[PDB]
Amino acid sequence: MDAMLLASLVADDRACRIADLGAGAGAAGMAVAARLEKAEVTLYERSQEMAEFARRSLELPDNAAFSARIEVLEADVTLRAKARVEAGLPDEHFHHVIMNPPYGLFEDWIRTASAIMVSGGQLSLISRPQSVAEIIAACGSRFGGLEITLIHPRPGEDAVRMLVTAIKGSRARLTFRAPLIMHETGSHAFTPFVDDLNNGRAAYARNV
Amino acid sequence: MDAMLLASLVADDRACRIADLGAGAGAAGMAVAARLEKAEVTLYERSQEMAEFARRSLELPDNAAFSARIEVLEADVTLRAKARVEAGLPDEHFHHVIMNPPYGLFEDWIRTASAIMVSGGQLSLISRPQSVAEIIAACGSRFGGLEITLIHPRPGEDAVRMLVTAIKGSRARLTFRAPLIMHETGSHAFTPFVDDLNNGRAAYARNVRA
């Protein structure tokens, strides 16, 4: 569900360039492209092995509808400056950068996300709730207007995931959005809104 | 409302000692004492005027049932070491420390909360949600097992307040609890759980160690 929920944060019906910094073989960036016909998506992978795996995944007839709009690049997303540009992570280029790092990397990855982002572009990420301090510190002097949306399995239960979006250069203080509850009490199905997100039928937009 | 929500975090039926580090005139500490007959509350105020004011409030006849259990002390809660003790903030004495600091502060107040707390005692606080990073940093190496409960005014709307509880010396990672929603859409009435908290009819307890 992580990749679908992450992808749903790109609430943008304009032609845009999106970078998916990992981790995965591109499932989130692929979900974005499947939904947004005008999205241009770049999947970054550190290793040749992972890049080749993502590439073979994109050669499946199953993905033919959107695969032309996706490119897989081998790049270490923790690189800096000249090394970063030379690795194919260009300055001030992307309208969106999305990430789900493995379970820290937030400082390195958000530093890169800021550098490769156009002015006012949107950072989107999903994590565990316990990463919140690391994430806020990593956004310092880079991204503001953070919107944090906790994800709870059902009423009364602790949060299991956390969505965060932010805007490069924004001065706005952070806000916690109303939480997303995955199920009603006593119900096996997902709640209507979460179900639409999970199936690519809807985006989850920022307040403004 | 901040004071009632804050006070509701003390879920303890023992004789216990509670410090209110107090941004206010002791409303939170008073609400704790009103609900918990066995609690012994110390209200700390930096200024003589505020201490005076709090003492006058305690004399109001509506507070007479529990006021005997509330002591108001003048003390700068940012004091350190021996100065802190001399000011009447004793080492490792309180079972609970509660706070609602006014809008370095969290660091100073939580440093003091840790110093005056018995081993395993509970920190309780209410704040704006925007303070979350400062609060987590101030807890560092002093308090753990943070439970963070966001407070939303009604369904779909952003959080307006945040409750945090933590245990001295715990090395458990933080938890976000299910949030409290103050009101149903279209009503000025409180939601039933929150209404109980408001009436002093209930505590809001931490997750069981289970």
Question: To probe the interface with B, which of A106, A128, A176 has the most B CB atoms within 10 Å?
Answer: A176
**Nearest CB to A137; choose among B133, B155, B159:** B133
Contact A45, A77 (CB under 8 A): no
Judge: A176–B129 Cβ closer than 8 Å, yes or no: yes
Count how many residues are written for chain A: 208
Distance from CA of B154 to the nearest CA of A (A): 9
In a 10 Å sphere around its CB, with 0-12 CB exposed, 13-18 middle and 19+ buried, how is residue A59 labelled? exposed
> CB count, 10 Å around CB of B210?
3
Contact residues, A window 177-196, toward B, CB-based 8 Å cutoff: 177-179
Q: What is the extent of the structural domain holding A113?
A: 2-199
**Strands A117-127 vs A161-168: parallel, antiparallel or unpaired:** antiparallel
Contact B33, B66 (CB under 8 A): yes
Taking phi first (over 0 means left), then psi (-120 to 50 degrees means alpha), and beta for anything else, what does residue A68 get? alpha
Distance from CA of B136 to the nearest CA of A (A): 7
What's the distance, Cα to Cα, between the start and end of chain B in Å? 31
Q: Which residue of A has its CA nearest to B135?
A: A133
Cis link prior to A23 (omega < 30° from 0)? yes
Amino acid, single-letter form, for residue B73: L
- How far lies A178's CA from each of A15, A162, B22, B79, in Å? 29, 12, 29, 38
Distance from CA of A165 to the nearest CA of B (A): 14
**Strands A143-152 vs A180-181: parallel, antiparallel or unpaired:** parallel
Give the method used: X-ray
Per-residue burial over B91-118, b = 16 or more CB atoms within 10 Å of its CB, e = otherwise: eebbbbbbbbbeeebbebbbbbbbbbbb
B7 lies in a domain? yes
Contact A51, A79 (CB under 8 A): no
Helices (H), chain B: 2-8, 27-35, 48-58, 81-86, 105-116, 132-139, 192-198
A206 lies in a domain? no
A33 lies in a domain? yes
What whole-number distance in Å separates Cα of residue B134 and Cα of residue A16?
Answer: 35
B206 lies in a domain? no
In a 10 Å sphere around its CB, with 0-12 CB exposed, 13-18 middle and 19+ buried, how is residue A114 labelled? buried
**Strands A143-152 vs A175-176: parallel, antiparallel or unpaired:** parallel
A207 lies in a domain? no
What whole-number distance in Å separates Cα of residue A60 and Cα of residue A16?
Answer: 24
Judge: A178–B152 Cβ closer than 8 Å, yes or no: yes
A112 lies in a domain? yes
Judge: A150–B176 Cβ closer than 8 Å, yes or no: yes
Place of tokens 């880079």: A142
Beta bridge partners of B165: B124, B147
Chain breaks after residues in chain A, where C lies over 2.5 Å from next N: 103
**Nearest CB to B175; choose among A133, A158, A174:** A158
Place of tokens 């019906």: A13
Place of tokens 């509970």: B122
What whole-number distance in Å separates Cα of residue A173 and Cα of residue B189?
Answer: 29
Place of tokens 């952070």: A174
Q: At what angle do helices B105-116 and B132-139 cross, to 10 degrees?
A: 40
Number of folded domains in chain A? 1
B207 lies in a domain? no
CATH number of the structural domain spanning residue B49: 3.40.50.150
What whole-number distance in Å separates Cα of residue A9 and Cα of residue A204?
Answer: 5
Report chain A residues whose CB lies below 8 A from the CB of B136.
132-133
Contact A74, A48 (CB under 8 A): yes
> Which residue, among B201, B210, B4, B193, has the nearest Cα to B98 in the 3D structure?
B4
Contacts of A74 (CB under 8 A, 6+ apart): A44, A45, A46, A47, A48, A51, A88
Question: To probe the interface with A, which of B128, B148, B176, B181 has the most A CB atoms within 10 Å?
Answer: B176
What's the distance, Cα to Cα, between the start and end of chain A in Å? 25
Report the 3 state secondary structure along chain A. Answer: CHHHHHHHCCCCCCCEEEEECCCCCCHHHHHHHHHCCCEEEEEEECCHHHHHHHHHHCCCHHHCCCHHHEEEEECCCCCCHHHHHHCCCCCCCEEEEEECCCCCCHHHHHHHHHHHEEEEEEEEEEECHHHHHHHHHHHCCCEEEEEEEEEECCCCCCCCEEEEEEEECCCCCCEECCCEECCCCCCCCCCHHHHHHHCCCCCCCCCC
Here the tokens at position A81 are 């400056």
In a 10 Å sphere around its CB, with 0-12 CB exposed, 13-18 middle and 19+ buried, how is residue B160 labelled? middle
B208 lies in a domain? no
Judge: B178–A129 Cβ closer than 8 Å, yes or no: no
